[PDB]
Each structure stands twice: as structure tokens, then as C-alpha cells.
Design a protein around this ligand. Structure first.
Ligand SMILES: [Cu+2]
Ligand SMILES: [Cu+2]
Ligand SMILES: [Cu+2]
Ligand SMILES: [Cu+2]
Ligand SMILES: [Cu+2]
Ligand SMILES: [Cu+2]
Ligand SMILES: [Cu+2]
Ligand SMILES: [Cu+2]
Ligand SMILES: [Cu+2]
Ligand SMILES: [Cu+2]
Ligand SMILES: [Cu+2]
Ligand SMILES: [Cu+2]
Lengths: 172, 172, 172, 172, 172, 172
């Protein structure tokens, strides 16, 4: 056992490792989206920039989780980072919807992690999740919902002008 | 009677209190509109910012009226601030129309207050109303009329792109 | 249902709306106190400034609650803002005591809200309440208790000199 | 009862007082260590500086706890600050190990305090402990574990050169 | 024996250790006073600040004594830091009187230490005591006497206004 | 076919995709190493910093490759990012040796890619590889060889002092 380990259950360690893998997968999905919008036949530069920024944020989240795993005396168990489900995201609106679904999945995983930590009486882990992840997820979900609503109201995905103007004005 | 009271009729005091309540109600209505446009299924951020600014201005107007009530030796009688008539404003254009109607109602109340003050030979009250409220109301009504005209000409409320572009270019 | 809603119970939404109304009522009470101390026959300017600042803070609290209501996919239901219980607060000390009672009532409402959120397993709501409201309420209650103790020890409300000197030195 | 006291159980107050005493004792232990390393026959200046800084931090923790005790309407009950268990710490590595043990004991006491506060439904106390103490304890334990690991790997306590170089490079 | 020890009698070392314990006890007493005046039912913030500053100064004095103990080749023998005699100090004036008594006790201990050092022909110790402690004690005693005289003349402890105004004007 | 595609063979596109996957895998391996050295029982902070920087550089390389894939009209085909071969790297020296082996493998893959591009008469791809990857790989291999040589000469992995001093002086 680690010399620093204290009130850190094995189930919590395993859940943290699974969350690390999930964050890495989310970063990979966002990277795929970003370079989809960099394609010559899509050419939505600010969509690509937005999704690249999201990928970097997901990477940072994974980094913070690994840092905690080391801090609490747990051991990081890395797994394969699965390829994203889709290679073509078909539009800016569809990509935004997929991002919203992914963020809600990550939020659900974090909520289950918080429930596990509460069941294990690990207040430090609960506070870490609340401070660094829960409100970030809520804000991200709200932002993606706003983007999806605006894109739908502007006439996307049928109206290419809608996605162009959203790219310029909202994501620009 | 107040030691500072001079040429301040009771009817004027009551009308000032009613105007204070009306300004508070207008602030509350604008707050409702602003947080309506902050909703995920509406997501018009600059509309929300505009209506929040209007709410703050209405609050300032109420503050100035209470300050006068104290200055003239009257006593402030606060009443319930009624909830806004609507919780869903259905569009940016409809919200702008409702704001125009509210501002015209406030203007009519101020005109009646000025008429009462003139009938009571209270030149200080008349000058206060003229200096701080009448031209502000005229400018606000003109601005809201311009916004409504522009939104109607752009194709709102049917065209969501119209309200999006108005949000970005005019209110942004 | 809102596209962003996740782990947000209806009871939590209703409690948030009630808390919004309570914060608005507290702001209104503080406004009443502030303009009571601006009266010519009271003339305690820093008491008025203090209570006006408290009113603005309460308004900000209400704003934050409405922002969360939108963030979590809930819908803001506004109610009538009831008039304050008293129009004459009879002294600086009595106003401070009433403010202390109001702050403790708000604190109790927030504690009940936190208990409800815990019962509903909504860690984001619990963390929001803890981060933004609980310690603020504790600090406000402590400050008001200090003010009340100092005013009582100085000889208020019988000693007008006591309230004058407290107005100058503590609230000034 | 205190005029500011609200949702503050007596058991929580007693536990807070015990935690205050524990923090003072930890500060005293760190002071003893620091001036042990200032001895002419030990002469590890940066070890002394490190332990003096730790003592000051422990003092600050005790200060924050007393501040909360006053804020919540509890009454501070001070006890004797027991002398440290050891007067000679025998090495830098042994002192680091003792510091790690002390920090883990403090962490366990804080976890028990958090459990008590949770059992008493005192969310403000729980949030205070999480915000100001839990992560600080985790970081301190991790840092001390790193120091102990490095000292052991360098060949301490047998190798005086190891402790000298650690004093210069890590603690310097 | 220490390699640096020269003309340092054992009795002097023991007296230095006793003085270290006395300084720590004085710091603890001042801390108790400071957080007594931070209570909601006392609420004299500048009294608390003054006594906290005194506690920090006492800590610094203890630090200097331990530094000398190491410098002269003596060994620091730490003892239990006894709890302060009183938990409730009943007023600002009573706290000031207790502080004056404590400072005079510390001064008497330092004078006995100087007499012992003179009897042992240890001029370095005598000069240390004269340079760093004797005049500091005289100044502290004079300041506390001035505070006590002013508080008594203003009408304390019966007049709460007296202690309030002293808190603002002298300690502020 | 892409409207921008010109002199871009399918085999080159597939090789570019494989190189993208290899760069992502290298970044993942470096991340694993970095957080291995952040462990409490390893505690080599500058080793962790070095490997984290290497991971970020590998990520940047992957980014540049994807950018080229889009520029030349190819389509990015992402694959699973395999978990690193090892979870425990057993020392700084062993980690450096593994990094050297990985960099040489990446260099061999890049050389095969350049050979393929030459066989396909794609001078732009050849120049891209030469400008951005070949000399970077040579420099990285040289640096890792220098690190390995220095660690071996200092007595690693048996001498923990060797790895500590290398961590401080070379990687610090
Ligand atoms: Cu994330
Ligand atoms: Cu995310
Ligand atoms: Cu108005
Ligand atoms: Cu208006
Ligand atoms: Cu509030
Ligand atoms: Cu409040
Ligand atoms: Cu501590
Ligand atoms: Cu500690
Ligand atoms: Cu002293
Ligand atoms: Cu002293
Ligand atoms: Cu590379
Ligand atoms: Cu490389």
C-alpha cells in the first residue's frame, strides 16, 4: 500500500481510472470533430477551433484526474483509448448535438463517481469532483444546448448560410 | 408633519408612491424578460443583457423617486410588487413589443403625475419629472419602436435567423 | 423537458423558485430600511448606505439563483414580491435586529434547500449552495450580531449619541 | 445561547475545540523539529526553514478554526498544548517520517470531524472542512511522502551526503 | 558537550528554557484574549487585532530565545504550554489589566534571568537580554499602563461607549 | 475525390493515418511515464515534467500530420490508441531507454513514410517530412542517448542518488 494512502477505497480508485479513460476518449472525439471541420469540403474554421479547444480542456480534465490518483496513493491504470464512434459528423449542428450527448454522458459518469465517493465516505474525493468537474459539466452542457438551439432556430442543417453565420458570429 | 415639507401636497405624495411601485414592477418585468432570453431553448444572450440593463435602469428610477419622496418630506409607502403578466414572452419581437407597451404605460403615468403636480402648483416636482423622467421615457420609447420596426422588417418572429442577426448586430 | 436537464428534480426546481422569491423579498426589505434611514427625521446616512448595499447584495443572490435555474434546465416561476412587514423601523438598533432575523430566516431556508438537494442526490446543487450562499449567510449573520452587540453596549436605542457615533465610526 | 448560533450542534463545537488543540500541538511539534535542525551538531538550515514554515501554517490553521468557532456562535475552549513526543528527531529522514505520521493523524481527525458534521446535517461546517483543510492535508501528505521517498532512495539516514544534498536541492 | 559551547552555564540554559516556555504561554494568553474580543457578544475588533499582534510578538520573542539556545550550544527542552488562566476576560479594561500583569511577570522573569547571567559572568547573555527584551518589556508595560489609565478615565468597564470609542480611536 | 487533391496517392494517405496513430500512441506512452514519475514512491518531479513535455510535443506532431492530411485532400481515419506496453517503468534510466526505443521506432516509421512518398513522386510530402519530422527525431534521439549515457555513468539505476542528482541538474 502507498505511504500516503488514507481513506481511499479501491472502488474509488477503479472509478477514477475509468473516468480518466472517459476523459481521454472525449478529448479524442473532440479532436476528430475539430479536424472534420478543417476539411476542404466542410471549411468551418471556428467550429474546428471550438472543438480543438474542447479537446484540450478534456485533456486537462484527464490530467487533473491522474494528478489526484497519484495524490491519494492510487495507481493509474491506463486503457485503450477507443476511436470515436463517427468519422463524419455531417454538419455543425449534428456535431454540436453529439458533443452535447457526450458531455451529458460524462456528467452522468461524474455523478455516479460522486455517489460512489459519498457511499465510501471520502469527502476529499467528493469535494474534488464538485469543485473541478460538476459545475464545469453543467456550464458546458448549457453552452452546447444554447449552440444547438441557436443553430436549429437559424435553419441548420439545411441552411448552409445559417451554419456559416453561426461560425462567424457565435464561434468567431 | 415633516420639518422640511413645503408646498408638497398629499395627492402628490400618493402619486409618487404609486409611481415608485410602477417603476419597481417595470424592473421586475424586465428581469423576467432577461432571464427568459437566458433560457437554453431561447439562448439570445444580448437580448437578455439588454433587458437586464433595462431592469437596472428601472431600479435606478425607483431609487430617484424614493430619494425625492424623502427630500420633500413625504413618507415612502411601499406596496407588493406584482409578478409580471407573462412568464413566456414567445420571441424577441414579442418581448420588445411588450417592453414598448410597458414604457408607454409608464410614460402615461408620468404625464398624469406631471399634470397633478401642475394642478397643485408644485414647480419643483414638475421640474424633477421633466428633467429626469420625461425625456428618458421618450428616448426609451423611440429606441423600442426602432427595435420593433427592425425586427418586423427582418422577418421576425417567423425567421429565427432574423432574431439571431438582430441579437448580434443591434443588441451586441 | 429541457435538453440540458440532468439530475434536476422538480422539488429542487420549486425550492429554487421559492428561494428566488425570498431573496427578492429580502432585497425589498433592505431597500425599505435604507430609505427609512434617509428620512429627514432619522438622518443616519451610513445606515442607509449599509442597508442599500445589503439590498444590492440580495439582488445579486437572486440573480445567481435565476442563473442556476436556467443552467440546470429548470424554469423560473416568479411570484409577487411582498411588501416589507414594517414601514417604520424605529431605530438603527431595531433595524439591525430585524436584519439579523431576516438573515437567519434566509439561512434556514438555504439549509432546508441543501437538505432537499442532498435527499435528491444532486451534488451540483449542494455544492452551489455551499460555495455561494452558506458561508455568505454565516458571515452576514456574524456581522449583524456584532453590530447589534455594539449598539446595545453603546446605549442604543435610548442614546441617540450612541447611534450617531456608531453610524460615523462603524458604518462610516 | 449566542445570537448568531444556527444549526451548530454542541458535539460539533467540542470537536472543533479538539481540532484547534490538535493544530496547536502540530505547530508546536514542527517548531521543535525546526529548532532541532538549527542545532550546531545537526546544521541543516533548509530543514529548519521547512519545519518552521510548517509550524506557521499549522498556526494559521488553528487561527481559521478559532475564527469559525466565533463565527458559528460557539465558544473557544483552550486546553494545554502538550509538549512534542520527541526532543531529538535523529535525522532529516526520521523527522520527515514523523511529520508524515502527524499529518496523517491530523487528516484522520479532520475526516472524523467531517463525518460528525455530516451526521449533524451541518453543511456549512462540512464545506469549510472540505474547502480549507482536506485538500491541504492531502497535498501535505503527498509532499511529505515524496520527501521521504527521495531521502530513502538517496541513502539516508546512513549517508550524511544524501541529507546534505537533499537539504540544498529540494528544501533549498 | 557542544563544540560551540563557551562560558554557558547549565543554570543559564535551564533559565532560558523556562523563559521560552513563559513566552509561549504569554503568546497563548494573548491569543485567547484576541479571540475573546472576536466573539459576537463582545465584538471589539481592534482589541482582538491588538492582542493578536501581542501574541505574534510573544511568539517572536520565544523564537529569538530558542535561536540563542542553539547559538550558545545549549539544548532546547520544551514543556507543556499551559492553558490561559481565564477563558472570559469580562471587558477590554480587564483584559488590558491582565495583559499588564502578565507583562510585569515576564519582566520580573527576565530580570531574574539577567541577575543569574550576571552571577555566572556571562556578558553575552546579559547583553542579549538588555538589547532584545528589557526595553521592549518596559515599553510594553508603559503602553499597557497608558491604555488602562485611559480606559479607566473614560468610564470603563461600566460605560460600553467608553470601550467602543477607545477601540476606534486608540486601538484603531 | 477532394477538390484540392493533387499528386496525393492513396498509399501515402494510409501511411499518414498510420503515422498519426503512432504519434498519438507515443504521446500516450510519454503521459504514462510522466505520471509514473509523479508517484509518491518514485517522486522525480523533473522526470515527470520532461515526459509530460514530450507527450505534448508528440500531440503537436499528430496535429501537424492531421493538418497535412486535410491540406492534401486526404481523409483522416482515426484508430484506437493502444495502451502503453508498461505501467511501471522501474526507474528513470529504464524510462529513458524506453523513450529512446520509442523515438527510434517513430524515426523508422517516418523513414519508411519518406521512402513511400519518394516512390510515389510526392515532393511536397517528402519536404514536409524532412522539414518537420526528420531532424526533430534525430535531435530527440541524440538527447535521449545523452541522457541514457549520463545516467549509466552516474551509476543508475542502482544509485538512487544518481537519478536524484540527474533529475535536479540535467532535467531541472
Ligand atoms: Cu471533461
Ligand atoms: Cu467535457
Ligand atoms: Cu422608469
Ligand atoms: Cu422605463
Ligand atoms: Cu441573500
Ligand atoms: Cu442576505
Ligand atoms: Cu493543519
Ligand atoms: Cu498540517
Ligand atoms: Cu515577550
Ligand atoms: Cu510581552
Ligand atoms: Cu513525434
Ligand atoms: Cu517523438
Amino acid at each position: 500500500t502507498s505511504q500516503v494512502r488514507q481513506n481511499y477505497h479501491q472502488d474509488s480508485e477503479a472509478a477514477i481510472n475509468r473516468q480518466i479513460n472517459l476523459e481521454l476518449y472525449a478529448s479524442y472525439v473532440y479532436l476528430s470533430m475539430s479536424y472534420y471541420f478543417d476539411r476542404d469540403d466542410v471549411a468551418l474554421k471556428n467550429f474546428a477551433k471550438y472543438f480543438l479547444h474542447q479537446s484540450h480542456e478534456e485533456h486537462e480534465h484527464a490530467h487533473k484526474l491522474m494528478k489526484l490518483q497519484n495524490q491519494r496513493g492510487g495507481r493509474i491504470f491506463l486503457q485503450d483509448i477507443k476511436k470515436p464512434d463517427c468519422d463524419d459528423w455531417e454538419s455543425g449542428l449534428n456535431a454540436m448535438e453529439c458533443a452535447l450527448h457526450l458531455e451529458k454522458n460524462v456528467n452522468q459518469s461524474l455523478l455516479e463517481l460522486h455517489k460512489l465517493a459519498t457511499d465510501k465516505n471520502d469527502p476529499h474525493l467528493c469535494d474534488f469532483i464538485e469543485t473541478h468537474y460538476l459545475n464545469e459539466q453543467v456550464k458546458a452542457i448549457k453552452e452546447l444546448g444554447d449552440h444547438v438551439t441557436n443553430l436549429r432556430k437559424m435553419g441548420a442543417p439545411e441552411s448552409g448560410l445559417a451554419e456559416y453565420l453561426f461560425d462567424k458570429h457565435t464561434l468567431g
